[PDB]
Design a protein around this nucleic acid. Structure first.
Ligand code: SF4
Ligand SMILES: [Ca+2]
Ligand SMILES: [Ca+2]
Length: 1118
DNA sequence: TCGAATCCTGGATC
DNA sequence: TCCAGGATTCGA
């Protein structure tokens, strides 16, 4: 043990050595200082007793650039529950058995929601243990746990213990829960003296943040063609980085042919990017220079793109090959999980954010796309085959490109990432890098821990999984879930305001609507505006206008008119449903508990009942067969799980793995006795939601909603003030206002993120508070509101798309759109009401809203007040200029989430179910799809619209038919060459065949087995015609031949084509033109020609066929 | 004997 | 985590 003690002392002094090297002095004598808290880590530290105790370090910074550490001791503790009344005796045993390890043992009561009648006000006692250091927590936990399990299964001193809680919350999270310390607050701290603990006080007085120094860097390398770079053979060729708006470029002068000299590269006036240049004799000097410059400038935040996965290891290895050990110089080291970390400097990252939080569509996560979308400029791109060629022949081009990764990533990080992470971190205890790396579901739980602590409620355990659970009829389940909602495109076609369409609508629906018109607007005034009608003079005039319009619609229900395109959606519908229904993760009970609760008496109104749908997939075998298989596995002993030990009885093996053995043996049996692979069943259930259970969760959600709207209000105010400051042009005031604007906007984005996270936690596996019921009841209710909405609209008009959060709709031009009301209250001189929204809002107010909410009046009397509430509230959008949907090639199948939309300006408002870039798709489709949508806006009637957009396809088709005769072949290659790359060794497949594989075998044949050796072969192929009839996995030809010497080409082509008599080899002879013309067909048929036949227009492109089902349906309908 | 279903592989650094 | 594309497997 002493060897571990001295090892952890060694690492402690090593960290303090680094901190002194990076200027983080300690506090050493009594005094007070004010500082901003940037980071914290746990550490073991000595005290006056020379014992070793667990502690936490806090790192503070000051406006003057000074920095300091402080450290605080704190003792872990965890709770245990004895059998009734045994507390003293068991505590006497614990104190006897673990004297010298237990720091203290104590009795305390707690609130515990599962306790019978607990709402009457009962409580239970728990013992609290505590220890001098986190190791003894482990040692005691490991010894107590099995007695806990034994006593659980069976139901002496350990036999008395019954339950145990709260033994796995991280120690440094524990400390921030208990002592209310969060980072990016300002603090004042008093060191009273080494005899005494420090004391820390919040200073919310100070709002303005300091500026940390930030460093961003990237490296570029040699590598062999068609391969990933090799840490053992390749050499770093240059490294480039930004510090706080300044750029430096270090060149490995051995390779780069010329002495680079300084230059400037600005993407835009907002991005200056001046750059300074250094030349170093060789890679060892470049790495020395960089390790010197970092240790000089002492950066505090490092930032990099994907840097954990590629960029760090390549530096670490080459430094080690020169003996310049990374970890001693900078400090960065690989953690247990595989992330590079350091004690004094935080490794921020982008791609974790681009994934988790940035709302960007899949496959557009490439840096260059993110630069286009959020930064809005054209980065430069160059084919990684050429790197060495430029280095030999044209260095300035390689510099010019290679700086443009740094100048992009630094500004992206500063502008978008930095105020988001340091906003979100203000409300969570975890460290910044945990908050970035950790999955968002865990943040919701950590946040809920704070409230559960302040409410004095003891945590539940993590949810235990069951093995091979059974239905009552003994079907072993394989899957179980709530019935999810659905997405469906109802119709396909092209819709635009300019193009009249035919409508049919039921007149009786209008004779219902016109009865309620005043009531409708009254509601919009009374509930939504909170401006009583008595504050308006002309309320009657617009009501009679509306009634005249409704009458004019009623007179002629079937008509042709221009369309109005509206989008209807509900903001944050699921939180609103939670707030409305008082759903909580512990509100459910079985009726067996209301049998106990004294509040169960005649005419009580605490029971709310609601319904949800459940789905299961399970095997047909029943209780006998499963129990017989279990007895089979008991009667015959297993082999050892692997042949490194003796045979095992069933009690001597991993139970969870035995669950897989049982599953496999059932799957092997079933086909003898039964004749179905899966049975899938759906069912509907209802559950009593206790309406006056403790409320802290809903109170949290409501608080977050209200704070969200507060910060939106302040952001609007500060944006106006910023416009005023920028008009004035006073640089200090401009700075102050812009700082406030960023701080408020980041805070509102952070709360938006948390709010959206509050739903996604409840379904998570293993999480502390969990119930699929609450996940189901919300989701099923989220369908009724949408279905009843269409149950209205489909009588008025036509819905085009139905989606999880809203619908897309089209209404006759004659419909009442919006109005303004002449207020008397000059506080708000005019109000505008959108009638199509207000007409919907009252429906959901009437049907859905809760009228049996309850709230506590008095803790000593438990008098309760009944109430009603609602917050479900539709929002309207647009109206939009145009919308387009595709159609499926196959009959009888429905698209999802795939369409385009255009705003009244004519610019794209949306384009979804597609993307403008992919690494796995050939160029021709990408160009074609882009050009067709931009053409669809042209023309003025449907026959003109299709007559115009046909002109792109009838271009490309003749490009192919004319063999691209006039096109340069370099363009031809770029137009038709696929792309792929292999992430595995060829040995790891054994045998299988696909086009992605065959090219690698052929490249090996061409270059030798050098290509085989490892993962990361990059390959480019085209599909040949000549070997007729074989599957397409055969005919793939790698491009690299066509660069090679003629006779070598002839020799290998005659082989792979199986033609000893071909006498031409120019690519035009070889290409299987028919394949490409077909696959372009398989795109055009999904956009232009099927929809037109589905929208009463004759085929606009005769050179491509319809499928036979449509051809017959056309003939039979004609 | 043909059609429907199943499973496989990649994207994200260079 | 999600979809396209291709081939094999399974059923009438
Ligand atoms: S709903 Fe009423 S009777 Fe049922 S457990 Fe809750 S408080 Fe008791
Ligand atoms: Ca790069
Ligand atoms: Ca990189």
């Amino acid at each position: 043990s002493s060897v571990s003690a001295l090892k952890r002392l060694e690492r402690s002094q090593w960290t303090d050595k680094m901190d002194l090297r990076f200027g983080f002095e300690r506090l050493k004598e009594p005094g007070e200082k004010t500082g901003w808290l940037i980071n914290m880590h746990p550490t073991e530290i000595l005290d006056e007793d020379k014992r070793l105790g667990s502690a936490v370090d806090y790192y503070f910074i000051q406006d003057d650039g000074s920095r300091f550490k402080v450290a605080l001791p704190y003792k872990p503790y965890f709770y245990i529950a004895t059998r009734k009344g045994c507390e003293r005796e068991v505590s006497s045993f614990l104190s006897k058995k673990f004297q010298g390890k237990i720091a203290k043992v104590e009795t305390v009561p707690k609130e515990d929601l599962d306790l019978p009648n607990h709402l009457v006000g009962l409580k239970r006692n728990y013992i609290r243990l505590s220890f001098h250091t986190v190791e003894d927590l482990v040692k005691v936990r490991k010894e107590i746990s099995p007695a806990v399990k034994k006593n659980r299964e069976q139901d002496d001193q350990l036999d008395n213990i019954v339950d145990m809680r709260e033994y796995d919350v991280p120690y440094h999270i524990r400390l921030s829960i208990d002592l209310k310390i969060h980072v990016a607050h300002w603090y004042n701290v008093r060191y009273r003296g080494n005899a005494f603990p420090v004391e820390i006080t919040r200073r919310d007085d100070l709002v303005e943040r300091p500026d940390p120094v930030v460093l961003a860097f990237d490296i570029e390398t040699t590598k062999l063609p068609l391969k990933f770079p090799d840490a053992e053979t390749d050499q770093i060729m240059m490294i480039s980085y930004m510090i706080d708006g300044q750029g430096y470029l270090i060149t490995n002068r051995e390779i780069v042919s010329e002495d680079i000299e300084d230059f400037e590269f600005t993407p835009k006036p907002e991005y200056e990017g001046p750059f300074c240049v250094f030349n170093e004799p060789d890679e060892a000097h470049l790495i020395q220079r960089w390790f010197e410059h970092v240790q000089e400038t002492k950066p505090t935040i490092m930032v990099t793109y994907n840097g954990d996965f590629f960029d760090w290891p390549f530096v670490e290895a080459r430094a080690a090959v020169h003996g310049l050990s990374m970890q001693q110089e900078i400090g960065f080291q690989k953690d247990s999980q595989g992330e590079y970390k350091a004690p004094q400097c935080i490794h921020m990252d982008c791609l974790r954010w681009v994934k988790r939080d940035s709302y960007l569509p899949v496959g557009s996560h490439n840096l260059k796309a993110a630069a286009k979308a959020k930064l809005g400029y054209d980065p430069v791109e160059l084919d990684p085959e050429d790197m060495c060629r430029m280095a030999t022949e044209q260095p300035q081009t390689l510099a010019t490109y290679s700086v443009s990764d740094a100048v992009a990533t630094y500004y992206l990080y500063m502008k978008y990432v930095h105020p988001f992470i340091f906003a979100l971190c203000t409300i969570i205890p975890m460290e910044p890098d945990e908050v970035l790396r950790k999955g968002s579901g865990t943040l919701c739980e950590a946040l809920l821990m704070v409230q559960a602590f302040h409410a004095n409620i003891i945590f539940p355990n993590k949810q235990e999984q069951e093995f091979n659970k059974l239905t009552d009829d003994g079907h072993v389940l394989d899957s179980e879930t709530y019935v999810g909602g659905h997405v469906e495109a109802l119709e396909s076609g092209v819709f635009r305001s300019d193009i009249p369409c035919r409508f049919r609508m039921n007149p009786a629906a209008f004779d219902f609507l016109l009865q309620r018109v005043e009531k409708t607007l009254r509601h919009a005034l009374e509930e939504e505006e909170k401006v009583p009608v008595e504050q308006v003079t002309n309320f009657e005039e617009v009501c009679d206008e509306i009634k005249s319009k409704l009458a004019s619609l009623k007179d002629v229900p079937s008509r042709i008119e221009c369309p109005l395109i509206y989008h209807l959606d509900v903001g944050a519908m699921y939180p609103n449903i939670i707030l409305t229904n008082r759903l909580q993760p512990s509100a459910m009970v079985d009726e067996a508990t209301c049998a106990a609760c004294d509040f169960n008496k005649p005419g009580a109104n605490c029971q709310r009942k609601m319904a949800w749908q459940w789905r299961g997939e399970f095997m047909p075998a029943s209780r006998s067969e499963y129990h017989r298989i279990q007895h089979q596995l008991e009667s015959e002993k297993f082999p050892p799980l692997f042949p490194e030990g003796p045979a095992r009885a069933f009690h001597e093996l991993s139970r969870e793995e035995q669950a897989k053995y049982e599953k496999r043996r059932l799957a092997d049996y079933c086909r003898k006795a039964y004749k179905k692979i899966h049975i899938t069943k759906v069912e509907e259930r209802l559950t009593t939601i206790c309406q006056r259970e403790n409320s802290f969760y809903v109170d949290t959600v409501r608080a977050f909603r209200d704070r969200r709207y507060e910060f939106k209000g302040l952001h609007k105010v500060w944006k106006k003030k910023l416009s005023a400051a920028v008009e004035v042009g006073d640089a200090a005031e401009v700075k102050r206002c812009k700082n406030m604007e960023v701080l408020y906007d980041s805070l509102q984005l952070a709360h938006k993120c948390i709010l959206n996270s509050f739903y996604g936690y409840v379904m998570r596996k293993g999480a502390r508070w969990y119930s699929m019921e609450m996940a189901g009841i919300v989701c099923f209710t989220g369908a009724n509101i949408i279905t009843q909405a269409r149950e209205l609209i489909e009588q008025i008009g036509r819905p085009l798309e139905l989606d999880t959060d809203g619908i897309w709709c089209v209404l006759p031009n004659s419909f009442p759109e919006n109005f303004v009301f002449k207020t008397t209250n000059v506080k708000k001189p005019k109000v505008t009401i959108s009638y199509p929204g207000a007409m919907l809002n009252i429906m959901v107010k009437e049907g859905f809203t809760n009228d049996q909410y309850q709230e506590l009046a008095e803790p000593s009397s438990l008098t309760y007040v009944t109430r009603s509430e609602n917050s479900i509230f539709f929002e309207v959008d647009g109206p939009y200029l145009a919308m387009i949907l595709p159609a499926s090639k196959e009959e009888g199948k429905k698209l999802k989430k795939r369409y385009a939309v255009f705003n009244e300006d004519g610019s794209l408002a949306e384009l979804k179910g597609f993307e403008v870039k992919r690494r796995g798709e050939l160029q021709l489709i990408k160009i074609f799809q882009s050009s067709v949508f931009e053409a669809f806006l042209k023309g003025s009637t449907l026959e003109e619209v299709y007559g115009s957009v046909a002109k792109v396809a009838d271009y490309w088709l003749d490009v192919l038919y004319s063999k691209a005769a006039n096109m340069p072949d370099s363009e031809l290659f770029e137009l038709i060459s696929e792309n792929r790359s292999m992430s595995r060794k060829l040995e790891d497949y054994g045998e299988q065949k696909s086009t992605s594989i065959s090219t690698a075998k052929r490249l090996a044949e061409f270059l030798g087995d050098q290509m085989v050796k490892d993962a990361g072969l990059s390959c480019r192929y085209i599909i040949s015609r000549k070997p007729e009839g074989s599957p397409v996995t055969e005919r793939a030809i790698p491009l690299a031949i066509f660069q090679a010497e003629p006779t070598v080409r002839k020799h290998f082509l005659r082989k792979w084509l199986k033609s000893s008599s071909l006498q031409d080899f120019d690519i035009r002879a070889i290409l299987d033109w028919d394949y490409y013309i077909e696959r372009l067909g398989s795109a055009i048929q999904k956009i232009i020609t099927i929809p037109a036949a589905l929208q009463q227009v004759k085929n606009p492109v005769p050179r491509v066929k319809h499928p036979d089902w449509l051809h017959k349906k056309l003939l039979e309908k004609n």
